[model samples]
Target: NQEDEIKENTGGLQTSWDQIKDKTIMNDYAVIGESGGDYYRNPVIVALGGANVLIVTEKRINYPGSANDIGVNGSKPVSIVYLLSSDAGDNFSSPLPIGGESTSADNAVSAPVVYYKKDKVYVIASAGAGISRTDQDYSARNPKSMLKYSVGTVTGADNKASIQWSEWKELSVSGKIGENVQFGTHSGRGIIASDGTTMVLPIITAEQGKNGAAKEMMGAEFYKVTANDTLTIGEKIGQTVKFAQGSGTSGFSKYKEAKPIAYDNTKVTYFAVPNPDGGDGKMGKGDSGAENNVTSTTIPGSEGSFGFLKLTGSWYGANQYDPSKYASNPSQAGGATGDQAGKDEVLFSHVTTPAGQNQMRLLDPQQYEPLSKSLQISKTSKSSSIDVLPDGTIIVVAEKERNTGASGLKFNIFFSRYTQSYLSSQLEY
Candidate 1:
């Protein structure tokens, strides 16, 4: 392991604030990775020491009875894969599948999240036992999903970076939360606590509503990874997210794209992007392009306030096209919501506190507009993940959809980096 490659930056807290205060600049924006024989989704980026970065994505493998071919689409199998970057977000190595190759649907895996501490890099993802999707057998589907993880030690420099992963092992939640509730890890990235030992991750707990409640109810579970490499479960924060859980017909609304970061030593701030499938009974449920929110929850095992503050604002809305906003122009041709023909606008939020001038700003309206003409990018479920460089450069990775003629729809990961000063110049649309 390249233990010496991992160095603790002396300027931790105060320097972080100064980096955030710096003016925004578009440092880089390019395609870092794309899907191959398998469809790639849920791309996550995490900054390591210096310019080193790690990206993890779910590879939907196309096999004999898989979903979607060249054009026609269907459900396929999945496994986890990762990519490495040495020069910020500009370039990356090939996608290296985790746990080698999969031979059966029982090897299904998805939702891989990456986190780092001291000299080790930890990955947590959801796994299923023989979860088949080729057939429409709803009743035959398994409800039990398990969490599996692999801890790796980094070796070599960023330019020639590599990770020596340990064997994939089960991350048991049964002992922590009991065996009754089914659980899954939130996508995007988990954060290291101020102490730099414990890892804080948001978790989803799904259970049937007691009597005649919604068919199924989903809520949040607090989980922290102790320095000893042990998994510990904590309390449930607030209410279940606004929408229905995954077991519901519409599917889980917003857990697919959770971006959690260390707010202060005592708290963690997480962001929820809107659902892209913005139809009547689609992912966002009845609310199309519903509001986006930034919530602050106390770091698990910390002594700070355990509750969360909803950083609500009008600008928190998603880029989903509201036909009402385009109604004045009758020539506007396409569906009413963003899932159809609309500009892919990345909504940026600027918030100081719960009582400050929290507003919205658009990063690249013109650039994303054309990208959305075919398949909207920013609003896709689990399409975006964010992290900040040691220099305070904000890197945002988004899934760019491709209408690959005969291949149906494919996703490619793209990124954009900028500073705070550049953000202020962006006027709200």
Candidate 2:
């Protein structure tokens, strides 16, 4: 019966029938959309209110002039968000326009991320050139250039029907913050941690004219928000524990973004993009090759700022913990590796183009020692977001590129269930 079922389903492994049918099955293995032009990419999925929902942008139609027109500057790039229901994850609703108006037919939201807090939902997008910050009311005092946020609420008779949304809000402060910072090229997401008292947001910023050029530097800012705090300003409470210098030429070449996972009030783990300055010269053009090239280097007598540092915070650290002991790293400060204790963990994706592969690395927060590296579940995909489910299953979203001849196609989103045990055993130094 099993053989019969196999033949019925697959029609044989190598026959013409199998070739046609097996390929179809493989296509089914991938979540594809209806119609030939229908393509879905940059998928961000979240489990909310007992339902699995996904917000993705679809590039299905073509432009008048050229293929490139299908992008931000195209005749009308359609960026739509869809909702999916059922535990089986099989059904989906038609896409709704989350972004309003099209100044240019080529407009689309890039690297969008969503955050659901309390009964409110927030979405952020990195828009391209020609889009003015003032056009959306997100201009800081200085204006010129800045990232924009679209905040909305899900409403209906019972929090259902066509969800309602609010106007846009600019999150950056103009003159106070340098123009050097734009929302990192990749989007970021956050959650309530530390008993819902603290909100941690991780942002990546690198200084210009560094050792390897505008190498990526990591930093994060924490916020304290309350329901009654309508007129208050969100404060920049903390900075990341620097890990490594960045590598690569200026302007989008070398960059890092941080996505954090908070456990209780005092512990949090951040996932980041490897800084070019780490031993991994693979990122910078024409450099030396080394295994696990993204690991931090010891600076001898001088203090070592490991890799791109993102945001850092302890929900309850200030109240019950020793701040000084929590911040020291023996390996980074020229001390023995085994001497450190009480550290958080840092996870990141590292890729070596010369070696033709990618891997995930973990660092101990206390000693800043390279702890482990794990085989990436997706080849050629940069880890973008990582979340650990209550059952101990790890979910990660990566920016992936699929090359077809001269056309290099790439986008961001995720895949899940990659375990912590597998990561620790494979990546630990």
Candidate 3:
């Protein structure tokens, strides 16, 4: 392939991918784990090669017990200490509880990804939702799993160095470790392959649906570990799809809605919208329809499909009929998953460009088409972890919110960038 002689030779087209919108706040002194005491959603930044940078997230608590209604919990597991875009606050490292002491992973784990071989760095997640009776059994106690870690290295005060991890384990693929029966990847964050020990994730379960009750369904699987210790599984490759819970109305029929992170060069991009808060069928006195698109899949590559350049950008509003100044806005505001419209999911595209003949496009669709909440960029979306570093030029990410200032108190998580000469200046022919 084009072994990077600066890449471009055409035939492998590109759209560049931008949005660096002047940011570098890798956690602007982040107020103790996710700027607000563990509850931090899925974030996975990685670099460790030269420029140096690595970030991990997904630490929730209060699952299956203590409370209910999916309040907050993913069992437990944390990591920190990584930043050096020339030093962006030396993160703290207190919560390092990977399966704390694992007693069949109570409650469960969420989506977190990063896998390396040299200097050893691995972190993967998704361990049972502790069976809150989500319909049937995700193996009930253990069967549904994924969570691995190893990446600890700290040294400061001129010693110059950063990183800390290693404790969580489970990804044996069966026999009894990090199991997976039917589905339970909590389907969201994860997708690796670049000497990171090959991974291809996204799986879930909920039970009942389409009026029958219960809901949620996602698919796609593949796992392997060149033996740093364990992990292996193949089968379950394609033919498993369904995700677009509620707000999207029944327009999705059986199921269809995505959000997978990044992985291009073999296809793995998803932003497929729907549910501007009209989930479970109900929006605009009707509830569900128009789920603005963004998809570029490959079922975990070698080959891939499900619409390469589906593009649609972002558009949703129809619930209790939207606007009224969104009641003056600010319900959740980003990781605290912004609300008001109920299913208000916006745009996100993990950059994929190699277009037209070798097919693959959809990276920076007009900087994620937003600014409609009466032109205020209200109910923002979720997008982070574009990753791609190692002399192939660059590709960074993080787009938690935008409005820059004004009320969001300058809320940020942005820090964007993309190069390969900006993909040869957005080539098209």
Candidate 4:
């Protein structure tokens, strides 16, 4: 329900806060109401309403069992898909199940990409195929993977009470053209293209064989509404563009998920996090550093290459020596030492551990060289989400897990905001 606090403080207008306390509003909704301990996961997108917020999350509950009850990472108990909300973000409505009475669990919602046009809010999510309890234990009983969508609409004056929804339509991708023609695991974000006729959702797909298969990062397929009132996937665009080195792998090291945001007509930016266990360059073991933490924000800069931010170190693991560990050795890590007079160039932050305890640096985009070493920001355990506001302020969101010591426990979300002026003046290149 911390989302409520965000809504109350911002109140529908743009929000600018210098500190964390000033940023938070209140929790409008709770995962569990009268009862306690329901968990939410994957991605969360905020609709820019001053006080109204809608959150879509995969819901799960814990079950009681013996000491060896489940496996190393036992799955959650419940298998229901729900959408919860807060009028004020502090108080929340009971979760309204989105996936009806299906035995299978619908997991993984693409970030809630909201398009507010013509006084309507259209929220789109890509849903993974439902998984039954039986499917988890045996391959023979498990169902083939599938992808679908769910949309929610909120209209009228109050915007207080609204209708929620889900349409069980399967996604269709053609594999006839070439090697990169198949759809694998459902990954990537959706965008309302500038043309208005097309909605491009980029996905990472592989060959139809094993669960974790070698695949390629394909182009964004254009979906257009035909005269017959049906949606059809069109030919691929930007076919020459290749994504992360390792297209597919089973473990945590693989580079899979693809997220895209359209900057304009001639350019589009995409973010792909490589699977830690799958990419070509190895980051070392127990070093969850840049493995699963890789992010690429591509903007049309030059003809061949695009503008991007590639994380060089792992944010997790203990006693692991990697680029991100430079914080422990600030003096040697080039603390505050680089060129400082550059304009309209890309910048890279100095390598630091997730704890935000290290010296940071920035790199000049055109020359691809370190600009300044004086630039430093407090680090967090895992920095996953990054976004740039309209005014060019860079925002990074970090995940702080609970102290239970287990890796997969719930995590708290934190944000770090960096301004353009600070980048230009603080560190010169």
Q: Judged by TM-score, which candidate is best? A: 1
- Span of 10 residues, lowest total lDDT, candidate 1: 299-308
Worst 10 residues of 2 by lDDT: 1-10
Best by lDDT: 1
Clashes of each: 14, 23, 10, 40
- Score candidate 3 by lDDT: 0.34
C-alpha RMSD of candidate 4: 12.7
Candidate 1: give its CA RMSD in angstroms. Answer: 15.3
Model 3, residue 154: C-alpha shift (Å) = 5.3
lDDT of 2 by residue, 1-429 (tens): 000000122211121221222121110112332323333444454433322334444342332212211223223443435454322133446555566633443345444555654455555544442121212222232322334455555543122223455554445544434565532323445555545544544443433232233333444333433322221225543443343433443333222444443433443444333344343442221101211122323211111011222123321111122222222321221112213232345654444441123455564454444443445444543223443322222344343443322232432233333333344456554
* Model 3: residues with Cα > 4 Å off, grouped in runs: 1-45, 48-50, 53-122, 127-142, 146-164, 169-183, 186-203, 206-257, 260-385, 388-393, 396-424, 427-429
Error of 3 at 97 (Å): 18
Q: What is the descending lDDT order?
A: 1, 2, 3, 4
Q: Against the hidden true structure, what lDDT does model 1 obtain?
A: 0.45
lDDT of 2 at 107: 48
| C-alpha TM-scores of all predictions | 0.57, 0.52, 0.29, 0.51
Model 3, range 1-429, lDDT digits (tens) per residue? Answer: 111111112211121122221211122123221243334444455555433445554444422121212211234422222334422223323434443423334434555445543455555555544213343334443333444344454334222335555555555445422343333333233445565656654443334232234343432333333435444454333333444444343432222234344444344444432233333211111111222222322311110111212112111111121212222232321122223233222222321211101212333343333222211111232334444333222333332332333322122333333332332233222
**After superposition, candidate 4 runs with Cα above 4 Å error:** 1-39, 48-50, 60-94, 105-142, 157-161, 174-189, 207-231, 240-255, 278-399, 402-409, 412-429
* lDDT score for residue 74 of model 3: 35
| Residue range 1-429, candidate 1, lDDT tens digits | 000111122232112223334434344333533444666666777666556777777766763222311111122356677778776655667778787854444556666667775467788776652122223332334535567777777876334457777677777666555555545665556666668877776664544322223222344444567644444444333333443333324543432233443334444444433322321211111111122333222111110001111111111122222223222221231233312343333443322221112233343432211111111223222245655454434566655434234253354565555543353245432
